[PDB]
Nucleic acid binder design. Structure first.
Lengths: 282, 281, 281, 282
DNA sequence: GACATGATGCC
DNA sequence: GGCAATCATGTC
DNA sequence: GACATGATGCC
DNA sequence: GGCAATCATGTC
């Protein structure tokens, strides 16, 4: 197995926990010491297994035979999923005490922007647990099973979802408009209109993303955070974030979030995970 | 040292030579035993050195310390540049005798789609050695230099070239339309409108690229070929290709090339690098 | 010379009074018993005179020699300006008490939609008198002088006004944005984007108009009302209308007006010209 | 019973014949001495009868009681249809030879631009007789009957055609694409996007029309000629005209026609109605 | 949450 | 009045 | 080579 | 006829 480095501290229990909550049945498998899932890179497929080694601050990655031809890209995808690039000394020195409770926190990324786009859309309105359920049905109906690993299914490709019947997706438990949004996103992915990597001007791209049918500011923001691992974006419209800033309007929440620039993505995560956090008694 | 695998055969001499001719001073250094170049991933910057290991069918990649944080992405970038994914047994089994003489040929990719887009535009009409001298002046003028490696320079970012003065670009040795093409291409990249990875519908994606100012079909095809490593595209409008298919129009060339689907991009390279090659009867 | 019919009752004093307050020097002359103005239908130019005949319920129209070739269209233009089509019993039978005090009220139209669009723009945030003087200055500066009637100038054509210097106009007594709004309007008329006759979907047509620079919801509605003679539009955003509906928001006034469908245009007219009119509490 | 004057000479035999050949059953009635058709100006409807008095060169027009409230507009519609504004001395004195055998030649207009738009499109490819029959079928399916004249039917409104089922129109004997062209044209007229009156820059206007699905250069030119009564437009693409200029390409014909500016629409009619005509080779 | 409709200041 | 900026309201 | 114009075959 | 594809041409 391939091995990738990381800079301590790294809160692996928090990260794995974060992933377990959103895990999709038949696609991912999350345990306390490892993370494994189906993975498609073009027409190459397999299973990637990520095993952290805390004593050596190394991450071991195993790839099933089908992914070997594109080994390096699988490693890149894993590195983005686990935010291996993070230097906590930098971020913690800037967030100050907002992050002192859990200095090893990282930005959970994704393995594929299109999948993350599909996840963001399905995450609208519903609970984290509910989305994971819905996403599990979309994968079940539209995803390709692996010949070498039978109860692992690959997340649905852009081509398969683009040729799906809106009524069919609606039948899995989502409004018509949401099913439509998924089909439009798949087409954008096919055309290459959906940025699969973080753009130079994130706010302009999110602006373009919002013209898409079914994608408002919450989804564009959340997608930028997870799909691109954009490090400086807040979610002033998030359900939980509004509770964290009781009695505050979306714009207030962001003039406030401004203090955490240019690591607002990290501030966002800490707040979500700080049980009794509340704006300063200033 | 990180290490990556690749299936034999692999003509490193031919690959290195292809990159050597297009090498850009201060950015890349090409020798017959290794390839090295500046590299930027976001704000992480350093120098990468790739050394083929023929004995072991392996490619050894070394990254300076300032690139270590994004090591995996650097490896993916290198694996795409050198086409490590290729299974020559499959390509040649399909191309038959077109590829029988250079079985180890590979598709030279790129390390970043935007950079490759710039190279494609700057490579229009002029010669290979010229494009390389020109692109070097550009990297010289707009590239960020490495503190740890002064002798090197990172390729221009889309943000740097997007706010670039047109005439300033022109004065380097290119029509105004070209400088303008570069500027639009950077803006497009800045807002995620330029696909940085191969899209599901390559044709459609290429048609969209063609609505870009300064980008025609030849450039779109060539961009898809190297920028996305699209394996099934041909360049019927290429100058040399027209010579390989004497008196044949772009459509006749294209209709002929159909016999190599789905590996037309490899067929293209074999024909490009086979002087005196001619079509059948 | 020519004669057109109308259905009684018809308040000519009120109608001529409306046109007199907005009369544009050099273009039109309004008096107690007649209305006259310059008119251009293609390359045919001249003076039209309209004299109401109360005894016969008839309107007499005279055309100078240069307009005879296109006399029918001149007549049509006059019938749209004076709302000759109106059957007051149907309108009053519907508006109920609202129009019982002035049953001969008519919708003052126009004789050219472009010209009317220009007046709508020039009447923004100003007094009737100022708009008139403003329009007149525009008229003398970019119009056509009738050789047969030296004191009459034809209203500015779209071609002439689209090629005007935004600054030469600002200098007449209007903002820079007001002047660009006119120049934009003119290019619209020149290429046929400004509807010259009433569209089937007034709501949609108005929506598009609002995309025009310098044209908001108010100008668009007032334009439909007079330039298209749409009979079921209201002006909630009108300063005067906002005073007639004390402490009500556009949405509230608009919902209150629904009681006058499908004759809201006429209802608007009656409220505009009713001193202490107030909505039912 | 209303009267409009015209300038001699006026070839009524030619005009009535031209209209007679393109007459739409149940909508229009054309005889050797008069023209009559259904007419809708807004919600006002009736029948219009025009009777030409050669003697004292005047056109007598009668309106059904239904159009009386909009009499003036009906008169204007008739004046455009019969090109009564034409000063033949000015045209015949500018085309010389070309227009000498028929100096009473007038430009056949229309009574409504939208109607003329539908005709122009239905007049694509097929013969005059087939177009007339095709149009008659459209009027029968979507047209409005007059309570006072059960024999007459009003030409379909933008409102009905815009709501029409593409398949229903197809079944009348036209390609699906033509049916779709009609539906898009009706939507345009409803929106106010179809110039109902001659625009100042006919060139630009026609170019914009060519962006409409189903409308090409020929339809745009032909629409401008009859629908806006534009006097300076030629039809280098017309079939009959291609035979009048054997061997010449659209551009060559276009270059040639320039000699007749600014009355190219009249030259077009004259060349059309001169079987023996042929150009000069110098 | 997406999205269409609605209700202080500056040029 | 045109117009951007933005909380606020309200089915899907 | 990019890009305006001009000039065969399937709806 | 509309319209997408294709080929030659003259420019920058």
């Amino acid at each position: 197995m391939y091995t990738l480095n990381w800079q301590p501290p790294y809160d692996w229990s928090w990260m794995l926990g974060f992933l377990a909550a959103r895990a999709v049945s038949s696609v991912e498998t999350v345990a306390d010491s490892y993370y494994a899932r189906s993975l498609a890179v073009g027409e190459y497929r397999g299973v990637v297994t990520a095993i952290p080694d805390i004593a050596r601050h190394t991450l071991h990655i195993n790839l099933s035979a089908g992914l070997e031809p594109v080994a390096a890209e699988c490693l890149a995808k894993m590195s983005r999923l686990f935010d291996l690039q993070c230097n906590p000394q930098i971020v913690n020195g800037a967030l100050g005490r907002l992050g002192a409770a859990r200095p090893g926190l990282r930005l959970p990324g994704c393995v594929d922007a299109f999948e993350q786009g599909v996840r963001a859309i399905l995450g609208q309105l519903v609970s984290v647990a509910m989305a994971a359920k819905l996403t599990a049905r979309v994968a079940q109906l539209y995803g390709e099973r692996l010949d070498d690993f039978p109860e692992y299914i690959c997340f649905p490709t852009p081509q398969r979802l683009a040729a799906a019947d809106p009524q069919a997706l609606k039948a899995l438990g989502m409004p018509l408009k949401r099913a439509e949004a998924l089909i439009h996103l798949a087409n954008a992915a096919l055309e290459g209109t959906l940025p699969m990597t973080i753009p130079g001007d994130v706010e302009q791209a999110m602006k373009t993303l919002q013209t898409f049918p079914g994608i408002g500011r919450w989804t564009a923001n959340y997608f930028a955070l997870r799909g691109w691992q954009a490090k400086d974006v807040f979610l002033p419209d998030d359900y939980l974030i509004k509770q964290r800033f009781p009695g505050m309007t979306p714009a207030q929440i962001r003039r406030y979030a401004e203090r955490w620039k240019p690591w607002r993505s990290y501030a966002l995560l800490h707040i979500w995970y700080t049980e009794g956090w509340q704006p300063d008694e200033a």
